[PDB]
Amino acid sequence: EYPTVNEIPVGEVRLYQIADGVWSHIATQSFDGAVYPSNGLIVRDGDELLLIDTAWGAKNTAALLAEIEKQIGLPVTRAVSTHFHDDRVGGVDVLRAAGVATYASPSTRRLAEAEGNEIPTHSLEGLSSSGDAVRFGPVELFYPGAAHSTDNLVVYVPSANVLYGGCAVLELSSTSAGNVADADLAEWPTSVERIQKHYPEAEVVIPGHGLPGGLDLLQHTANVVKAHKN
């Protein structure tokens, strides 16, 4: 069913249909001597597509665009990066050069610049406080508070009851919170609680890495982060 690392080589991207006009994109990348799968989202908006997150690299992101053209046949016109790390902004330059308007919060843009990563072109205002929510094309963007990073955004597709958590949400098989160098472990469970409270009708929850599931990914994440912190 849902692709895993073993089934996607680095440089290749698969799409997985979640709902009508909602797909995840799955790519693999080598980081610090380990290969990991990574998810982002694609949402139909009329005869155009909104992309959430790059495919983690310029080559992967070019492969992503090529795979979208083959499988869906509609142009990607806008993209949003959900935090400042390279699984999320790496490839923005490819998108921009391809004519895609790239967006992120001012905080993500600042952090990306400070870290030497690619920087989305446009700022998304109205997301500076925990609980803030803004409409963007066919999705709602939500800032739940600091979790995996201080700037992390989550994305809800109202038409499909699909919640894309990015790296603020962990898959059910996870036993740890993973890379926590930029994380706020004290706040993270509270940030997840905000998501739970704001999107109780969510039917599918997609983590930044790994298998989609139901609403239980949220509580599981809070539990793992709490147990991580000890």
Ligand SMILES: [Zn+2]
């Ligand atoms: Zn990250």
Ligand SMILES: [Zn+2]
């Ligand atoms: Zn990540």
